[PDB]
């Protein structure tokens, strides 16, 4: 019943960033709007720098984040952090125990937070390998949300310039 709507630039940035990071895991923050209890809009993302610690709460550089968030405000992007994304190069979309810990930190800041996971190796033409998770409130610890993509008419026309003849 829950759905994460991912925008065009958000999806392209996450695929781009994941591929650029290979063979390492990368991570960043997702920006957007909690529309209602069953709906999260992800309108944009930004990359966090690689950290020696690997992907965890420690990787979140609060000085980088604050600077990036302030500068995005100045150019018209003042959306809430609605969660985080990270890459799993070659090994699919799920949360490890450390990922669950990271997500728990995000959930404590905002209980609506979403964890997106993308696989830049297994993502191929015709197959984007991505999933979105939240923690559950013998039970399993987390579950998967539907993902959909939102694009404007202007964005649709813009995307069609790739292979414009076709």
Partner 1 sequence: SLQHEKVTIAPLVLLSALDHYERTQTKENKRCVGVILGDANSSTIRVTNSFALPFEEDEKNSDVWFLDHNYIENMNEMCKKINAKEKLIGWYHSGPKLRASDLKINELFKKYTQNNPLLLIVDVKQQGVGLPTDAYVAIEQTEKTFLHLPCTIEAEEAEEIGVEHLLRDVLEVL
Which residues are known binding-site members?
86, 88, 99
Q: What is the Cα–Cα distance from 143 to 85, expressed in whole angstroms?
A: 15
Asked if 161 touches partner 1 (CB under 8 A), the answer is: yes
Taking CB under 5 A as the criterion, the residue among 99, 107, 119, 131 binding Zn ion is: 99
Residue 113, C-beta contacts closer than 8 angstroms, at least 6 positions apart: 81, 82, 83, 84, 103, 106, 107, 134
Binding residues for Zn(2+): 86, 88, 99
Binding to partner 1 by CB under 8 A, coded x per residue (else -) over 8-37, reads: xx-xxx-xxxxxx-----------------
Residue 109, C-beta contacts closer than 8 angstroms, at least 6 positions apart: none
Closest CA to 69 of 99, 103, 44, 50: 44
Residue 14 or 43 with smaller CB distance to Zn ion: 14
Asked if 52 touches partner 1 (CB under 8 A), the answer is: no
Q: What is the Cα–Cα distance from 86 to 67, expressed in whole angstroms?
A: 21
- The phi and psi torsions of 4 (rounded to 5 degrees) equal -95, 115
Shortest distance, CB of residue 30 to Zn ion, whole angstroms?
15
96 interface partner picked from partner 1, Zn ion, none, CB below 5 to 8 A per type:
Zn ion
Asked if 96 touches Zn ion (CB under 5 A), the answer is: yes
The binding site for Zn ion (CB under 5 A) comprises: 96, 99
């Amino acid at each position: 019943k829950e759905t994460v709507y991912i925008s065009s630039i958000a999806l392209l940035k996450m695929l781009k960033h994941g591929r650029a990071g290979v063979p390492m895991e990368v991570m960043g923050l997702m920006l957007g709007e909690f529309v209602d209890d069953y709906t999260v809009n992800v309108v944009d993302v930004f990359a966090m720098p690689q950290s020696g610690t690997g992907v965890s709460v420690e990787a979140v550089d609060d000085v980088f984040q604050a600077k990036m968030m302030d500068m995005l405000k100045q150019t018209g992007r003042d959306q809430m952090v609605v969660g985080w994304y990270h890459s799993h190069p070659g090994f699919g979309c799920w949360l490890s125990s450390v990922d669950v810990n990271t997500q728990k930190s995000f959930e404590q800041l905002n209980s609506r937070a979403v964890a997106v996971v993308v696989d830049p190796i297994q993502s191929v033409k015709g197959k984007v390998v991505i999933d979105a998770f939240r923690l559950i409130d013998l039970n399993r610890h987390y579950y998967s949300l539907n993902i959909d993509y939102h694009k404007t008419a202007k964005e649709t026309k813009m995307l069609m310039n790739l292979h414009k003849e076709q």
